Amino acid sequence: MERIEGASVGRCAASPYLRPLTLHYRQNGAQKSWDFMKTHDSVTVLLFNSSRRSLVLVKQFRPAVYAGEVERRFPGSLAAVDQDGPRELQPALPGSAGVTVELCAGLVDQPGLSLEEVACKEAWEECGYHLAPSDLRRVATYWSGVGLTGSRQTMFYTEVTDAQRSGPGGELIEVVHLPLEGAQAFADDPDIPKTLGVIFGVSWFLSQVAPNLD
């Protein structure tokens, strides 16, 4: 997975996910405008494999994050693309720089689907776990962009057994069974690039669900 070659940044003109806009409005009398983007809602899922006493997460490379780490470590690298085409990434960091630990997640695009379905979908696709929309329990709903994106995200949790997990042996995204003993320590450790989701999830599970179990 963690093998990325020939990173090059190019200027984006059209994109389905992008679609930036400007909102003009008179606040408290004063006429203003704001720059933001039509971006997609999303759903996240926490799995607890009761049979293994582990939590289920997705470690994967994120390009956004990778390019983010390159900008910190070599500023200006993300100078505006003004060329015949893409700029090559001059100091190119290891693939392991864009690699994040996250909750199982996905966009809310498919027209109609109850969030739960979009959840059980990602839970199948990403983790290889069969889920039923009745199994899922709403944890929280909140906004992610606020600044540049008015996107909602909804979070769900459900318990699983090895009976719902089945995968063959013939790998874009890693699956991460986090054993519960180490869960807390793991969340805290700043060496691991994670989302607040991840941190909240573990934090929440341990406080809310963990005590009322075997």
Place this chain on the structure above:
Amino acid sequence: MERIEGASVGRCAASPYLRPLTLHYRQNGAQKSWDFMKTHDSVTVLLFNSSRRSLVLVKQFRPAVYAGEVERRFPGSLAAELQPALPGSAGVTVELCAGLVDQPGLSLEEVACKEAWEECGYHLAPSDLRRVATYWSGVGLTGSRQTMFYTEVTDAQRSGLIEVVHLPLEGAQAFADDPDIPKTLGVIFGVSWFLSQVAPNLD
């Protein structure tokens, strides 16, 4: 504050907060590309006014959120000017005290005590602040880091259009949970974390 007129959605060409890009790369052999934006890092602060036994938050209108709520409630509205008519109260969010990490150099703490002064009217010293967590916010389209800090306050540091919200602790939990209030995961985590971590070891 919550008074917004003449909402219209408009095509953006240039922006100080935009600069989207496409990253071309060969992963595991396979050539791919991703759409994302050069965006700034950020810092957030949780204040606990010990004197009032309240937590300190910022309620403000966010245009992004407002337009987001209009799209949920009337899809396609964001087809490629348009007048929603939805109330100003639809873009109004409760958030942690927050700011960009733009000013070149500043130790995060300073950017924190800055926003804490500017937004909440609370005097803060970088020594007061306690790192809570660091994590990524965009992941999808951004890949920006955010750092979160917490510190306790007394009415003695508070003396200084965004609202300030003293959330009393009794109601804090219920408040976080309630989906009627547009909030960030920050907000949710903050309350969640404070109650579990700090609240028990106090009077």
